């Protein structure tokens, strides 16, 4: 199910060429869930983000 989330702060950009941005994001249906996710492109605080599936947390070196 498609779900909508809201970011809190940016953890920092990752990738070999710095292509993705690892960011801390949370949920509106409950204000208790908190996951870390990678989103590429220009990301600043305030945008509303879209999850196709909320199962795993994104993780890269």
């Amino acid at each position: 199910p498609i779900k909508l989330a809201r970011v809190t702060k940016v953890l920092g950009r990752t990738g070999s060429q710095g292509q993705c941005t690892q960011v801390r994001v949370e949920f509106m249906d409950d204000t208790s869930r908190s996951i870390i996710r990678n989103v590429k492109g220009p990301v600043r605080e305030g945008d509303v983000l879209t999850l196709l599936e909320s199962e795993r947390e994104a993780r890269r070196l």
Partner: peptide, 25 residues
């Protein structure tokens, strides 16, 4: 510490890098 090393390996470095790029009268 050990946990600091594990979490530093578990996270991604970020922060400072100065990229220098780019009236009245």
């Amino acid at each position: 510490p050990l946990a600091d090393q594990i979490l530093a390996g578990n996270a991604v470095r970020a922060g400072v890098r100065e990229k220098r790029r780019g009236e009245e009268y």
